[PDB]
């Protein structure tokens, strides 16, 4: 098909330690190249690429515009942070932890124990594997954190094993939605 | 840091399509329907605690269209170089036979933001219950998108997330099927 021309504009509010520190980053992007940006820590517009030179010069020549952006960290960032804090920064959904081996094999033959942790939020989460009380740090094949696109995450953490009768593997999960770490076992 | 709220918008030619959405730590908070001229929240729960004047978004888009025109000329009409998408089909939760589930088609790292997506059950298009998100921004300025297909697990059915994009030689099919 024909050539495409893309223009993107992003206003990013970076919040550190709640609100004690807020950086505002306004970016203009042409196709895939940022051309000009305003950094609240800098105070003015800066051309990133030559295509942005004309704009940075024109915009830094307008006082009202300069005054507006320099206060945006309060009138915009800190403000919008409040408007939705109750259901974003405070949102919490407990993970669903399931443990199952991948392919039904007779004992003593190598197997992949799967610890599925799904539907949780926020993304910050910790999953550890245990073999009869001792933590298994090796042979852990993970997908890493996966964002589902609907405010929930999921992660599959697999453990390489060669189950011997009697062994007890435990998948321990820690997440800000639960007080005491969740645990689920699988008997060999 | 801790959190990030991103107001992201764009306009693409010749498509004449635009977008306006707010993002919180990677997730969409809401976006503005250009046609209906109303703000649409990702989770309906959000509309019960906040609101947004959709008219404002339309104003920005008008200005963006005009700016795109200006940038295109000044760049001497250099077009965007296509970046084909990475596609992966996943399940929402571990599957059990005859236990409703959801197939997630995760389209990532691509540009421009135009993509034709089709769900196929045994080679036939399906629409029953399908849902999709708008284009989510990425730090590298490429885009991310999601498509959903709720279904009932079985041994008799196979699925495919068909994805078309200009940076792709031909339609890409991502296959999924129960494994017993």
């Amino acid at each position: 098909t024909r050539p495409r021309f893309l223009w993107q504009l992003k206003f990013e509010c970076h919040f550190f330690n709640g609100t004690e520190r807020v950086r505002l980053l306004e970016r203009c992007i042409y196709n895939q190249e940022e051309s000009v940006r305003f950094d609240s820590d800098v105070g003015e517009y800066r051309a990133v690429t030559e295509l942005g030179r004309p704009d940075a010069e024109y915009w830094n020549s307008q006082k009202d515009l300069l005054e507006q952006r320099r206060a945006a960290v309060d009138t915009y960032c800190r403000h919008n942070y409040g408007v939705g804090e109750s259901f974003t920064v405070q949102r919490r959904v407990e993970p669903k932890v399931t443990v199952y081996p991948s392919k039904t094999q007779p004992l003593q033959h190598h197997n992949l124990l799967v610890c599925s942790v799904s539907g949780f939020y926020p993304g910050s989460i910790e999953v550890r594997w245990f073999r009869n009380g001792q933590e298994e740090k090796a042979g852990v094949v993970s997908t890493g954190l996966i964002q589902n696109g609907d405010w929930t995450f999921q992660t599959l953490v697999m453990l390489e094993t060669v189950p011997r009768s009697g062994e007890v593997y435990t998948c321990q999960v820690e997440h800000p939605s639960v007080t005491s770490p969740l645990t689920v076992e699988w008997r060999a | 840091e801790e959190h990030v709220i991103i107001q992201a918008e764009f306009y693409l030619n010749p498509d004449q399509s635009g977008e306006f959405m707010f993002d919180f730590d990677g997730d969409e908070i809401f976006h503005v329907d250009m046609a209906k001229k109303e703000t649409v929240w990702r989770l309906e729960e959000f509309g019960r605690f906040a609101s947004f004047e959709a008219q404002g978004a339309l104003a920005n888009i008008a200005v963006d269209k005009a700016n795109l025109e200006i940038m295109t000329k000044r760049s001497n009409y250099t077009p965007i170089t296509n970046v084909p998408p990475e596609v992966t089909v996943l399940t929402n939760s571990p599957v059990e036979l005859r236990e409703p589930n959801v197939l997630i088609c995760f389209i990532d790292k691509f540009t421009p933001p135009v993509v034709n997506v089709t769900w196929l059950r045994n080679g036939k298009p399906v629409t029953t219950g399908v849902s999709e998100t708008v284009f989510l921004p990425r730090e590298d300025h490429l885009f991310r998108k999601f498509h959903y297909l709720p279904f009932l697990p079985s041994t008799e059915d196979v699925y495919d997330c068909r994805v078309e994009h200009w940076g792709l030689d031909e339609p890409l099919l991502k296959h999924w099927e129960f494994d017993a």
Binding site: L9, F11, E26, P54, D55, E57, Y58, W59, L65, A72, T75, Y76, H79, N80, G82, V83, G84 | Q7, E9, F22, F30, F49, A50, S51, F52, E53, G56, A57, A59, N60, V63, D64, A66, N67, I70, M71
Partner: peptide
């Protein structure tokens, strides 16, 4: 509470 938008500026002509 209402979400505040930042206005897009017009580029240099």
């Amino acid at each position: 509470p209402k979400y505040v938008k930042q206005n897009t500026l017009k580029l240099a002509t």
